[PDB]
């Protein structure tokens, strides 16, 4: 039984988002996005890089212990969301781990189509390992399409012989390009942050004709054996609630020690209201912890 912070947030998403069933222009929600982004706390420190060709930020809250990192993929369906949109919840999430953040501008579709993504994100897997950064003091998470892209750039670096991270939290992941998942009815009406068409259409343009159901671009079909022990987070109220309870089961088949959290009456990416969500707040503590206990063990 519900929090006035989240109900007070549903009807504000639901009165601010696009009637549903319309189509958007690509660049008119890129920019929508980016127009909207919250602002990182004034104690959060930036420092501009760029790794494997893409631009990035190192995000460092106070409290950063010397010598971890967390690669950062930023959620928005593969073809939007940017530094800037995810600049505040790293942030936080910077915070609550003690670790300082490495957060990717990632090639984006349709300019750029899967497997770009995935590219790009061991690709910087790899230059954190050149850096120095030693495996047992990594982590990987990332939200929605973000969220897939940790899987899938975990299978891939693994193929490649890379060595595992620490821990990995993917948040309110995509997994599942095919988008069939029964919660996409049974949890529509719940969830006001997202449609299709919608997410078919982002499906469309990062796919651009490959496979939906290629290990890279949908993890819930991938051999999963090997990765790092993982935390899960979902909301109760999304669309894209089976994607996670699926993942989770695929990891525990393939052996990975994973821990699914649904959260009660939240949203997608609930994480990214903090500024006035306790739960995204506590949530965000919550992955902090998680990286933290991994890298305790």
Known sequence: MAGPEIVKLKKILREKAVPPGTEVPLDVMRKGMEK????????????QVTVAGCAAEWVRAPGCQAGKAILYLHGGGYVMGSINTHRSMVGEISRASQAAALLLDYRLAPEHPFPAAVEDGVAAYR?????????????????????????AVLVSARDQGLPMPASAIPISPWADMTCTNDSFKTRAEADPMVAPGGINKMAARYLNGADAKHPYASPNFANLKGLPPLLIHVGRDEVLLDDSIKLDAKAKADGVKSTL????????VWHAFHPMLPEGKQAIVRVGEFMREQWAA
């Not at 230059?127 to 899987?151: E, N, T, Y």
């Not at 959290?261 to 997608?268: F, K, S």
């Open 127 to 151: 230059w954190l390992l050149d850096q120095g950064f030693k495996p047992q003091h990594l982590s990987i998470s990332g939200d929605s399409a973000g969220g897939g892209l940790v899987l």
């Open 261 to 268: 959290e649904i959260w009660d009456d939240m949203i997608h």
């Open 36 to 47: 909207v982004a919250f602002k990182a706390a004034d104690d959060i420190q930036v420092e």
